[model samples]
Target: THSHGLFKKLGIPGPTPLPFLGNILSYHKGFCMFDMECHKKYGKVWGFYDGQQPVLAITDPDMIKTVLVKECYSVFTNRRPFGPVGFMKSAISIAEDEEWKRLRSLLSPTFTSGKLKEMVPIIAQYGDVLVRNLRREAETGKPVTLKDVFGAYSMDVITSTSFGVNIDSLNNPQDPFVENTKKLLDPFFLSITVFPFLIPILEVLNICVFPREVTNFLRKSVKRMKESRLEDVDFLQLMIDSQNSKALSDLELVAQSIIFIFAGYETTSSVLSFIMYELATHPDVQQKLQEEIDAVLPNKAPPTYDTVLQMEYLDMVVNETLRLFPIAMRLERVCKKDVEINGMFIPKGVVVMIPSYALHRDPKYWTEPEKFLPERFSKKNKDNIDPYIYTPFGSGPRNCIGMRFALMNMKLALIRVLQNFSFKPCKETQIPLKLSLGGLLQPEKPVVLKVESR
Candidate 1:
């Protein structure tokens, strides 16, 4: 009882805790691995603690569905409280209650099918730049780091689409926009990991995850865009129009703009890098994908929005890549009120985590999950798999709002790249890719691939 009866009181099983530390020691192995180990050791639903905070790690598909869907969603609207207040408050990803609904409603239309289609030209423009750069790298007869290559590509798309400014990060690596954005988001994982307990206090003290320079740059960018009236139907313009027409404030506008930049670029780039790595190592899948691409666009026409949608194998490859290497290792929601599901009573304030990395690779949900097999996502086989088991962008109402945008960004980039070059594993390529210990799932080392002009 002295140990707080945390798991015992809830009538659940978990690893034994040590005084105030709980399972924080296990997290030394990295959050993703730690969650995987916990799920393997203790069945589907188990308990862990982040210092004194009680966390319920749930991998059950049905229970996860219940938590994310609308019926019970109101009770779990907010994520586990962990980020700086200034940055987190305006983020649609973490916004809670009515604020979340308002933000979601205002921003949802920006990524509608029509809006995303309009942005394809912007994405393709950068895709052209990416292919040009790859050709240059290919001529050198050296391995190309896919993460950096794609990182630049995605940054170009995000800045151009969201801010109506072409940073051309692919060509100009030292662009102030590129440098400032990195400074803005690069410290996120370290701060959360290193100073987990102080986040609430830090947030209350008006501290931001980004330095003053990053904030100033973003604020100035927003101001310039508003004054220029770029006349483009982009995210920044949309936010500015909303501020003029709706109840959105200047601070909220700035916050949302920064969030768009933060959330929009890196995750897509990470997934694109992983997809390239898979294609390089699994040449058969790559060839099959290229054939599909060629058939869809005979004569190698630039991938239009409709053509990208029609490429079934492209979708399969992207889906399989996301399954193996999801953007977020886990999805978490906190219980705002006492709730009961699957014969278990979850108390208020308990954090419930859905370990997507563990579930995505579980033998129960996938066959040869470790292997890179895009055919598993083929039309015939896809329906046989449960929807809840394959949540790369999460599921239900609170799922990733930018899903359509991210997918379009990726599909366009991949189509253009595959059309121009073939990727083969180089000596620098990690045979069995190791992931970084940082929060986001990315290759531990640069994913080097041999690029040959097709």
Candidate 2:
């Protein structure tokens, strides 16, 4: 189909295409960093010239649903193109086709709800350490960096849950592995994401966008795990039990383990930390949340999967926070085949981006979208909203496999934290918490808080 026909069908006009770079230059600045501004300027259904590619920026719920859910197999089979980084090509976040299917299925059981329930004790024990550590820090009256602290706590949880290794990152805040992993948290580096083809070249020359030391650390850790015949009820143990030869490779092991640790913890810990920060800033909400927790939990006992799942208010709070600040601010899908939707002809190889962050704030779909109103997610309101509009986890076949695991961990963590202490933000916190472009949709500055014993 001709460009004009494509434009007429899609209800959007992209910038004039450039040779070999279509709209790449426009996106060269960064991903999520430019989304809010672009959405403001271009509206929902506009397009950009990404280098030589005509990239469609979409937020129409039905359209997004079409691309992500209805056509997910055709669109998400390939890794949304990005720069390559070393042996990390094996990373599941970017793997496509048969390789992706194999890896995804092999790793699926690790995140099943049943597996998550068995892991609560480990999570709860770590939560205790978190409260005690924060209590000690609270005594100093110094500002705390909840983002960094939560990252550490999350790393510990993932390490124990995924690999059956607990390095106790809560107390030893500067654990090398934790610090190293956090350094690779950038979801969109201008150089990498824009110049997808350059990644393999960069990797061949031994350059890395992620921290070298951290990559090496994980590589070594996976090597050790694979070498040992440790018997444990952890995700890694399950992979070992599966006995799939493909699942046992050192490269795949390292890639899956690191990706899961990174994907599992970074955004999740951010969400938990941000939720606590919100609770701290909004004392009434915190008190209400605490009341619910106190009524539900019995004497600092760990929260069971059913109990945590039943915490409707907690779910709302988390949902609201995620709505305001989705860990993945945008979702991307590339058309794999020619498809027609809404009388628009979408041809093969077209890149589509759904701006979730923009949709969350859109007044059309939300009343006072800027407000931190957890009640907005109450069952009644949730049912009233378009189900496809608010995708904290991406939709369809490629949706987050670890969603339940991450949610359980966050719920248990929150329950344990609230059980021991009250949280209030320190003066240093940015009132609205400006997001940083540096890493996963994160706060520009630390959200400090005092954790006084209740």
Candidate 3:
């Protein structure tokens, strides 16, 4: 009750607050829909209270541009505090100020198009595993849960590319790498949704969210790679070389290695799975995509980096899927200095929320926003759309560092699968997908689809 008028005094419009809870209950109900409802009721820029902390739930693209891209970036550079404890503090995703810049500079080159080119063979190898696994599922004539299936494939891709470990997680589902990585990421949804207030407390206590065994597993892996002097052109080796040059400390190196795993695994997997679901439901789009795949990689030829990157339709489909179901439903930045934007004074330490879900589907920016239309990204129509209106991996300096790598990985996987098989909806398929109400955008029910060999 004491904090109820906090936003009122600031002249920020938002939903009525109840005691100290504020809008936490609405957010807990479903973060994406809650923001959408807020936008509908209160218009573009409204205030929200996460416990006692005031958050600006923003959807206006111009205001978002000011926050994410324009000047004052230094004052709004830090993200909402939510990284793991210890060395993970050095991870690029959560690192702040000079440390963030140092890590970003140190690791930026590793994900370049040229460096990612070398990873195509590794991605292709895992793509082979995916095709084989899907073929087996096809032979069984039963629907398969694609999220679990593709999740394993994406995990293998990240492991191989990041650690230079050839883990056939599709076959050996219980491999230590696969098992431990899952354990490491399991708490993310719960922590951010149910107990966000506890995050600062947990961090202050230096408690690691990841299990000790998982962290130990990563430490052992890093130590083994260092002792053996692995020369493989992988993320670990790149970070190791940085350490050798004194550009990074050993702890920082390990933190980066683990960050690659954490960053690349779930988000990539979720995007790929959603793309497959869209393909299954929209048969026409799938056929059009398959035609493009066939035209490019004729005679079932292996996909090269250039071929995948040059594929126009594939990029469209991936972009559209991201627009429809962004993996991160919200983008947050904490103000480091007081600033005024469009006549509103935002003080230091305020958390700013860019409700990407609400922005992506806003009627003013998108036509038939609810429909799954990949052609919105077509060459003819793409130039007409504003860049700030659609930020799947976010925008500006803090955008997803592994964007190129993730795109290449998804393109190769889809190219490989389309060349060999077709995805069709079955009895188990949910026509209108129901998404889970939490941090990540995932289907409420298992994404089951029929796999048929071409």
Candidate 4:
């Protein structure tokens, strides 16, 4: 009921909203389609309510730049509140203002080139595990559920590289670690995000956005892992090694370890699955990618981080997949003060939604925006592309910190798997995939495909 006329008063255009729900229902059909179409109808900026909260959706790259980059600290300072989720508060990804600054400074060094190079072997070992499992599946002649296989692979890499734990998530479906990490990815968990008022009650009921048992498991494991006196080049060990200089207490370091797993799991796995889908649907792209992989890592040699990054076509395919399915679908910022940009008015406290899904598909920015053409990211063409127009990870200070780590993980797995096998569309594949709304955009059904040995 509140702010129903807010858009009209501000001369912003958007679909009409109904009381209580405030435009959440229409999103049921598909968030990607709804966002793309709404932008077409409403133009550069629009306003609608997500329940009682007013959300201003902006697609104009200039305004988005102003919000995410230029005025990052002044007007759009912190991420929208994640309620009183204490574990995530200090987790740098959502850490606020000075707290965020401190956490970021302490954690930034963990992703250094030196550290990533050290992790090459550790990450590749898990990719080997993935290929082995997939080989078994291929022999069975059953279509593989891309998410389950890839999600487990992602979970394994994040844990081993960050916490130094070998959960072997692939073989065990009921592993407490596998079961809990997935619960957080459920689209219904977005229920609390849209209605943050439910957070206090949920917290009172002892329900955390990240399950409590999982948090305790990680916290304990982090502490116990430190006692082993093992020093590895992974992120957790680096943070622990710098504990005093960084001024991070035990609890603070533990919080970050969980954030690494939380942020890395579902998002990277989804990206890996989408890459497979794109390659399966477009055979030319897959053959070209395999050719490149074959040449780069010739004669079954394991890929070093350097080799993985050097595959130009693999780089383009990954970029194209990110463009088509920008992880997070949209990015958010809360207006801290009333302001006007490019003659468009916005008020303090309104949550600004950068509809990245729609922006990636806009006709003006891209030619044949719907097509899957990895060449769009070629060196000759990438310079013509605008950075702000394509954000799989958001732009500016608050963007995803593990972006490089995620990319390396995805490419390494693709190389390992592609070297041994190929992705072919199966009878169960969902064509013209239907998407579902969540904190992250997702396919309505599992992405299934047959694996063929090369």
Candidate 5:
């Protein structure tokens, strides 16, 4: 009723809105399906309300360049701050304005190329454990849900490399570390996310996006590690040593550490499972990747920082998988001030949504939008690609700060597993994955695949 009229007045096109709910129920079936329908009807630029919070979806390459890259600082500098979670407000991922700028500057060194290279050995060890564990599973003669395995691998490495804790999540899923982290991402968040304005009394009422016990236990993890002087070039140590402790408040320190887990765990695990699913479905692609792995890691050598970069085919397939099943359905940013771009007026409070799934699969940008082809990301074709169109980790200055770290983790795990074990499609594998409705893109069911020894 409120901002729905504003979008119409601004000449933006989108699905019809309901009085109070806006268009929240419009995409209840799925975000990507809604995206495809909206694109078919309204072209690139359109508006949809996330419970009265009018969101602008821009797919036009020029408009993307304008908002996220060209005028990033002057027009859009902050991500759309969501949730009323504590310690979360201070996370660099959602920090606001000058605080974000300064916090980002201080934390930038934590994920530098040099730091990632140093952290490679730490991540590689976890990959070794995962490969061994999967090998064990393969011998059991049963189908495995690679989603759960990848998710366990994600937690083990994230904790081992990021938090400096050697948590064997695969062997022990009931550990406090695993249980506590999972609580934050529980589906219980559906309440907070669906209708926010209706409920203002949360924190004191013992209601939070993440449970209090979990956050405290997490806050304690960083505090304990920081006190022990245990420096392993892990994500936590890097951040603590990034700045001389002058830039971070107690709140900021714990917040950043928890957010590292928040950002790293599910997203990387989710994408890797998708990649495995694609590989299993496409035998030639899997065989080709295994070939590349064997060729690069000659004499059965494990991938190092330099050697892993040589697997060109592996990179392409991963790209294709991410392109096809982007984890983040939308990249959102709030305008710094009310502004006009490409002759379209956007208010300051409006949230901009770049439909990543829709853009990556758009017929206009990609040939045969439904096909999964790795050659599209080849070195020769790289020149023809636009950065804004292929943003699995988003683009611009405000993009995911953990891009290299996550890539390193993904690459290492793939290399080790593919080096010896090949993914085989089984009856358990979901031929056409039933994706979860609403929120970020993820499969409704765990991705199942059979692992065979090479």
Candidate 6:
């Protein structure tokens, strides 16, 4: 099971290990944070120990695509679906093989570009609410917690679109469902995949590791939605529409619906919040972006999907934000069968990781990787780089299914926020963009800002 030769060949280094806990000592000893530092120290590949498991971390684009795309089965077989769920653990995110394939196929259309455009009105409606709320805050001269406000907006939009219920988090910011969704994503700041071995122990001790209340709220929402016998084109409706042969069990439906809401809210909100912060910090960039917005959206109406997509500069802004802070910093895959990658030995039952954050910041691939330059994403330039290296939504078959939904929602929301107001940084933002060490590479304190009407 030794991979010393492979490590040497890849120019990747790791702490020396003991029997069961391989490199756990060194890994636990330091931050082992997922960012530029890890790649700087470990080169393109490294070995790490997770409790008693040996795992390989790969940052090379070709090698990453090879494992995740061409040989996904052999690279991601033993992946854990999600934390334990009642008596059934059958959400699409965790399902694999035929079950995974069937569920993904059924739900895929809901997030496709065609289907997402149908919900543009729903998304725009939320955008209207957000702009109005922000204008109200601007009128009162109150500094806005962009993260919290957008978090609520994102939650409301997702809940409406996913569950067919117009649960307005704006009116009821403290709603139980909204509150639990907040708690659910809180731990994601921590590296769940790195400490996954503790999951079973955490579960056995009844720790409610991944936000138990969120799961409970989800279960209740799905149960109630099903009981109501409602029919709509929202996510739940899509499931009902694509229910091929056997219908999903009540538990299955609940778990899937809950995860959908979680997805619908978390990443998109984070990206939007960061986008706002970036605009605040970089006024020149903001001005350029605003020019694009004003040129295309000369009238004060919501931008259509086609219009949003055409705002080439805005798309670059989004791409740049993703480059700096992808929602899931890394991806996990387990070998389903023996497979050789980049001439490495073939071994089944091995765990591997692809560090998107690490790869995105590598200097060899990105020019001045630390600088935030949206122009790098210009259509002509974007094609020149390795696609796997710049994965915000990941790449290949098992990539993020809701990418189009998330992207469209993010673009529309950003447009609304920027059009109505301009922002200046408050005292809390970290200069030089210092991410919190305790969690995902998120800004430690909320990035607060003062808003002014344009």
Candidate 3 regions off by >4 Å? 1-3, 184-206, 230-232
Candidate with top lDDT is: 4
Clashing pairs in model 4?
none
Model 5 pairs in collision: none
Q: Each prediction's TM-score against the native?
A: 0.94, 0.89, 0.94, 0.93, 0.95, 0.89
Point out the worst 10-residue segment of candidate 1 by lDDT. Answer: 184-193
Tens digits of per-residue lDDT, candidate 4, 1-454, equal 7567788788888888887777776676556677788888878788877766788888877888999999888888677775557455677877778888888888888877778888889998999999988989999889999998998899899878986767778898677756756665245544644666877776667666677887887788777788776544677889877884648888898888877777888888989999999999999999998899889888877999888879999999999999988877888988889988767778888898888888888998999999999989999998998888999889998888788888998999999999999889988899877666544567878799999987
Q: Which parts of model 6 are misplaced by more than 4 Å?
A: 1-12, 18-21, 24-35, 74-88, 185-213, 230-232, 244-247
lDDT of 3 by residue, 234-274 (tens): 88877777666628887777778878777877878888889
Q: Report the lDDT tens digits of candidate 6 across residue range 15-94.
A: 65565445544533223353355567767677765534556778777788887788764355335444544433567777
For model 1, residues 1-454, the per-residue Cα lDDT tens digits are 2444768887788988766666667766677888788878889889977667788988777888889885345687878767676654777776888888888888887879998888888888999999988899999888888878898998888888888778668778897778888653135544464457767777778887667678877787787777777454788877776666647777677887887777867788888888988888889899998899999898888899998889998999999999998888788888899888777898888888888888888888788989888889899999888877788887877888889989889999999999989999977778899987765677788788899998
Model 1 alpha-carbon drift over 4 Å, by segment: 1-4, 184-197, 230-232, 244-246
lDDT of 2 by residue, 269-307 (tens): 889878987898889989998888878886766677778
Candidate 6 global lDDT: 0.73
Whole-structure CA lDDT of model 5:
0.81
How many pairs of residues collide in each model?
A: 0, 14, 0, 0, 0, 7
The C-alpha lDDT values of all candidates are: 0.81, 0.74, 0.82, 0.82, 0.81, 0.73
Alpha carbon deviation, residue 43, candidate 3 (Å) = 1.2
Estimate the Cα RMSD of every predicted model relative to the unseen true structure. 2.3, 3.3, 2.3, 2.4, 2.1, 3.4
lDDT of 2: 0.74
Supply candidate 5's per-residue lDDT for 347. 91
